Amino acid sequence: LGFLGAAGSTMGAASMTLTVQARNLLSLTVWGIKQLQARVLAVERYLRDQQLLGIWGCSGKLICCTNVPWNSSWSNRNLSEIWDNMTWLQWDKEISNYTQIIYGLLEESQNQQEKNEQDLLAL
Amino acid sequence: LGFLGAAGSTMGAASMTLTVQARNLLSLTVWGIKQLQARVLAVERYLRDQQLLGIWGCSGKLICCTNVPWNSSWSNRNLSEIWDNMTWLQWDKEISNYTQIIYGLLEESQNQQEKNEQDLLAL
Amino acid sequence: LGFLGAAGSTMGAASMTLTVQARNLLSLTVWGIKQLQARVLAVERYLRDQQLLGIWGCSGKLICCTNVPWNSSWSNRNLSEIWDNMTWLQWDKEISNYTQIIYGLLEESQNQQEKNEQDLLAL
Amino acid sequence: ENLWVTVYYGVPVWKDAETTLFCASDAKAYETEKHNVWATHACVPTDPNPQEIHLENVTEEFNMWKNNMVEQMHTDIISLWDQSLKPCVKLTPLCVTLQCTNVTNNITDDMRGELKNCSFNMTTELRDKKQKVYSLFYRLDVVQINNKEYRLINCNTSAITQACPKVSFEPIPIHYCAPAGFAILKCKDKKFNGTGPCPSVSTVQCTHGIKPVVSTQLLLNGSLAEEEVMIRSENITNNAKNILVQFNTPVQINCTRPNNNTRKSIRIGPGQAFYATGDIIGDIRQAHCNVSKATWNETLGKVVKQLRKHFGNNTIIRFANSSGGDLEVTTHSFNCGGEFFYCNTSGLFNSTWISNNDSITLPCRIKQIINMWQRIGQAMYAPPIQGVIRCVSNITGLILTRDGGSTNSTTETFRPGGGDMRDNWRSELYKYKVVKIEPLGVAPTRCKRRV
Amino acid sequence: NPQEIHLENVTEEFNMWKNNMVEQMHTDIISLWDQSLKPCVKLTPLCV
């Protein structure tokens, strides 16, 4: 329990405690200058993944299931040795080569069911 | 009509005019310093209830119906003496003892139909 | 391809490339002062149309279809001379007289299917 | 068999990342005020009860010598002193020649000039007329030029700026907090030497209270080791590297300025007052710090036991007094209630250790013109304190140094040493690492978005 | 043209002597005079 408490837990056990971390990421002298750039730096960094999480369609969600397959060349592991065996940090270090590829597939596949649903709305 | 115009109206009559208030909450000399902390203080205060309103699932809504009951020990009033009788300020003062309890139930109950819907998506 | 690349394309051909523009709008000396107001001015200007795009119900979308008709007195053109013939800048210049009218109909018509759906949830 | 990418938000993963930490000061102006050279008013209120989360299963790696939490606190205190010394008097008019005479002379002692009675010309009120004023100066701040004539030690190399007499110099604990989206990792190890894995980590919003007290040769009012004396050096085989000891039990050091001084005002210009020393009411005594002879003796045998873990179980370890340098590096200099002492710490480090109530009085002396440390052509004049100074504090460590010759020799000499207040901040912040939290993740889950 | 909305059926309580709108305008004008008197002449040479 607590912010980052499930940091050393396997991937599966740390997915139950997402709202602990998600609700903590937002919260003119020498002190005033460095207290004012801490506020600015904390809203622009929080809005950076809110925009990203919105071009993927997972706007107000902590877990969102997408329409892009795994390709099995990004990680050829089981669904059991990934979710109970590897922590989130290990998984990130392993899959860091293909995040910029998976991230670009997540938004090019969302503005494709946004026009397909826009075409289906006229019928 | 107008920002806060339905302030003295009963709870029921002031729920029809939500978009008036909701659309108004966002909008280096001695003047420049205090004009610059008015902008910063107004986006960080607006993002504080957008994040809160998002861990509850009511992301882009002005009225959102939740899956948590009222418990009848938070307020044992009718549904008619609450919605036409008490203004929003009166209701807030009366229910201020249990907001931190209701707020903590609203997000623990949203990341429970977010995993139930994630489990239901595989079947 | 690229930010604003489809600026001279007709309205129809520039609607396929929305995610290029949408993903680019966020991104104490004399240099420090003017680098700090560029960040502040760029998060507030981004939150002005996120809030607007949310009172209309199109929170996490790049194309949102609404429940308000066109009225045919705003522009009596075809659906083919508008979507393949006029660029977005031409359309904006032509329809600039009624944007503040269409914008106010988009939110008064969204907090009317937000109470209709709120009334339908009790039945 | 087929899987789909699902994004998670709020997954626990972090990276080391230097950022701009800010303030939390518990001791805000408790209806008492007296603004100081630091946080007080401007530092954000601190939590009544801070949250500490013990990250189980997790073994982080700390390096106390590549910490950017102390390279940022170093410049946060050079600029807290600059911003408080800009809005008050500049003592440029006091570069006159002084006609100093010994206060005692044939009064007491060997005719020592510990105090000089200097009279000079100054322009009071009108810029034409200049009347003859006088003040009491210490022998450490007047340089004879040749009842001879003197001059201030500083004003051929640095510019003096009298410290504003309303700000207080008493350090107030400071908590260094991190913005949202960052966290500070605390090593909860009891035997931590600032480098290597820490298998018992913790997460805190911001550090404990850190008094910004700067001293040399001895770390006063600091934090103590939980279990044993801890020796920490950047490169324990380099003589040019300082050694930071940390006491498990404090050694109390009392000292005073028993002279009942009296501040007097001299007008150096229109709307500008020079706060000199009028006279001394009573006997003229000497300042001094007191340390228990037995408590120091046993605490110095705990240090030599740990120094034997790095320098051979069978070796003779002897301490010696500082070799050379400024008066702040060769003497234990601190700041006791707005008065800067430079104590002669030669009776402490006068031992020799082979492998198998009484007090020590250290004759401190006072300085009034203070130069800035990592060096600039700048100085500060500290106006006299009217009264009798008496403060007691804890010694919580040492800053030692080794001398070359440990190639054939079977002995080690450990002269004390300070002068770099970056080694003052890392005797407190050694166990803190700032990390940044990355909350987005992807993972195959066999979900599928409903079309 | 400023907007003024009349809150009907609302009765607030005012205390003109615990207002912080005037304890903030007080220091906004002491520091508007300071910032305009720093960049010009200091008549120290006129103490003859």
Ligand SMILES: *[C@@H]1O[C@H](CO)[C@@H](O[C@@H]2O[C@H](CO)[C@@H](O[C@@H]3O[C@H](CO[C@H]4O[C@H](CO)[C@@H](O)[C@H](O)[C@@H]4O)[C@@H](O)[C@H](O[C@H]4O[C@H](CO)[C@@H](O)[C@H](O)[C@@H]4O)[C@@H]3O)[C@H](O)[C@H]2NC(C)=O)[C@H](O)[C@H]1NC(C)=O
């Ligand atoms: C290591 O840490 C210890 C404790 O944290 C410090 O000890 C403090 O030392 C300072 C400086 O001497 C003390 O402050 C001074 O105290 C004098 C006597 O204290 C009386 O008053 C206080 C406050 O009412 C009482 O709590 C106390 O019991 C005594 O009755 C005062 O006479 C001094 O007043 C002068 O300075 C203040 C502030 O500048 C002015 O407002 C006054 O008008 C007057 O000019 C001064 O307040 C402090 O009390 C000590 N605390 C303790 C717990 O002993 C060490 O100084 C510190 N050492 C180092 C090197 O940092």
Ligand SMILES: COc1cnc(-n2cnc(C)n2)c2[nH]cc(C(=O)C(=O)N3CCN(C(=O)c4ccccc4)CC3)c12
């Ligand atoms: C006194 O040193 C300055 C003198 N003068 C100035 N300035 C003059 N004009 C301007 C604009 N600044 C200074 N600014 C920053 C200064 C510092 O932080 C600084 O070096 N120390 C502050 C802390 N410390 C002591 O307490 C001290 C402690 C034990 C023994 C002796 C002295 C060490 C040195 C500074």
Ligand SMILES: *[C@@H]1O[C@H](CO)[C@@H](O[C@@H]2O[C@H](CO)[C@@H](O)[C@H](O)[C@H]2NC(C)=O)[C@H](O)[C@H]1NC(C)=O
């Ligand atoms: C420092 O020297 C000054 C002289 O400049 C002394 O002041 C004189 O003191 C005597 C005896 O108290 C008086 O009779 C004179 O009238 C004083 N003259 C002035 C101009 O003040 C002062 O007493 C000396 N102070 C110390 C501590 O020795």
Ligand SMILES: *[C@@H]1O[C@H](CO)[C@@H](O[C@@H]2O[C@H](CO)[C@@H](O)[C@H](O)[C@H]2NC(C)=O)[C@H](O)[C@H]1NC(C)=O
């Ligand atoms: C302060 O200035 C006065 C003069 O205003 C100096 O007194 C003079 O000293 C010279 C020494 O050669 C004599 O010739 C003058 O007759 C003196 N004038 C007097 C006494 O009015 C005095 O020495 C100066 N003191 C300093 C510089 O400390």
Ligand SMILES: *[C@@H]1O[C@H](CO)[C@@H](O[C@@H]2O[C@H](CO)[C@@H](O)[C@H](O)[C@H]2NC(C)=O)[C@H](O)[C@H]1NC(C)=O
């Ligand atoms: C300012 O004056 C002091 C004192 O006269 C100078 O320091 C002296 O330097 C000489 C040079 O060899 C030494 O012999 C003296 O021992 C020094 N004095 C003391 C008290 O240590 C200093 O160099 C001058 N500043 C300059 C020239 O920039």
Ligand SMILES: *[C@@H]1O[C@H](CO)[C@@H](O[C@@H]2O[C@H](CO)[C@@H](O)[C@H](O)[C@H]2NC(C)=O)[C@H](O)[C@H]1NC(C)=O
């Ligand atoms: C000097 O050290 C003593 C410890 O010997 C400090 O007194 C302790 O203070 C802590 C909290 O600060 C208490 O939990 C202990 O119970 C105290 N012990 C005793 C024996 O008093 C004292 O505050 C220190 N003084 C300083 C740092 O100025």
Ligand SMILES: *[C@@H]1O[C@H](CO)[C@@H](O[C@@H]2O[C@H](CO)[C@@H](O)[C@H](O)[C@H]2NC(C)=O)[C@H](O)[C@H]1NC(C)=O
């Ligand atoms: C230091 O000297 C001052 C004198 O300047 C003392 O203050 C005097 O104290 C006595 C009795 O305590 C009073 O009768 C006087 O009226 C005081 N005079 C002034 C000018 O305040 C002070 O008490 C002395 N301090 C110590 C510790 O002896």
Ligand SMILES: *[C@@H]1O[C@H](CO)[C@@H](O[C@@H]2O[C@H](CO)[C@@H](O)[C@H](O)[C@H]2NC(C)=O)[C@H](O)[C@H]1NC(C)=O
């Ligand atoms: C430093 O001063 C403190 C008091 O400020 C001394 O503590 C006293 O120690 C004696 C032991 O002889 C006790 O009887 C007293 O009760 C103590 N007083 C307090 C207030 O705790 C301490 O002994 C002094 N130490 C040195 C080395 O001078």
Ligand SMILES: *[C@@H]1O[C@H](CO)[C@@H](O[C@@H]2O[C@H](CO)[C@@H](O)[C@H](O)[C@H]2NC(C)=O)[C@H](O)[C@H]1NC(C)=O
């Ligand atoms: C450290 O102590 C030693 C001896 O205890 C001091 O050595 C003296 O150094 C001076 C040079 O300035 C010589 O003239 C003396 O003959 C030395 N004395 C002895 C007994 O050898 C040294 O001055 C002390 N230094 C400090 C900083 O305390």
Ligand SMILES: *[C@@H]1O[C@H](CO)[C@@H](O[C@@H]2O[C@H](CO)[C@@H](O)[C@H](O)[C@H]2NC(C)=O)[C@H](O)[C@H]1NC(C)=O
């Ligand atoms: C600090 O104290 C030491 C010893 O208490 C002093 O050392 C003296 O140094 C002189 C010459 O440097 C010798 O003639 C004496 O014999 C030494 N005394 C002892 C007891 O060894 C030292 O001078 C003092 N001051 C400094 C600056 O070191």
Ligand SMILES: *[C@@H]1O[C@H](CO)[C@@H](O[C@@H]2O[C@H](CO)[C@@H](O)[C@H](O)[C@H]2NC(C)=O)[C@H](O)[C@H]1NC(C)=O
């Ligand atoms: C360090 O300690 C030694 C002994 O503990 C001191 O030796 C002194 O040497 C002189 C030589 O003239 C003798 O007269 C003294 O009697 C010795 N002291 C004792 C206690 O016997 C030495 O002076 C000390 N050095 C310093 C700098 O304190």
Ligand SMILES: *[C@@H]1O[C@H](CO)[C@@H](O)[C@H](O)[C@H]1NC(C)=O
């Ligand atoms: C899967 O990944 C490989 C690796 O680059 C890539 O060549 C391929 O286009 C991707 N898509 C499919 C369907 O395999």
Ligand SMILES: *[C@@H]1O[C@H](CO)[C@@H](O)[C@H](O)[C@H]1NC(C)=O
């Ligand atoms: C993957 O899961 C299957 C399911 O039984 C198991 O037989 C197989 O050994 C697993 N693979 C690994 C590498 O654990």
Ligand SMILES: *[C@@H]1O[C@H](CO)[C@@H](O)[C@H](O)[C@H]1NC(C)=O
């Ligand atoms: C309702 O509120 C009471 C009051 O504390 C609490 O004890 C109880 O757990 C809540 N839930 C239910 C179902 O009553």
Ligand SMILES: *[C@@H]1O[C@H](CO)[C@@H](O)[C@H](O)[C@H]1NC(C)=O
């Ligand atoms: C609550 O509503 C019912 C509905 O008829 C009514 O009978 C009852 O008197 C109401 N209670 C109060 C306290 O008004």
Ligand SMILES: *[C@@H]1O[C@H](CO)[C@@H](O)[C@H](O)[C@H]1NC(C)=O
């Ligand atoms: C501009 O005109 C040329 C010629 O017809 C056409 O090929 C081109 O597509 C037009 N502009 C854009 C952005 O397509």
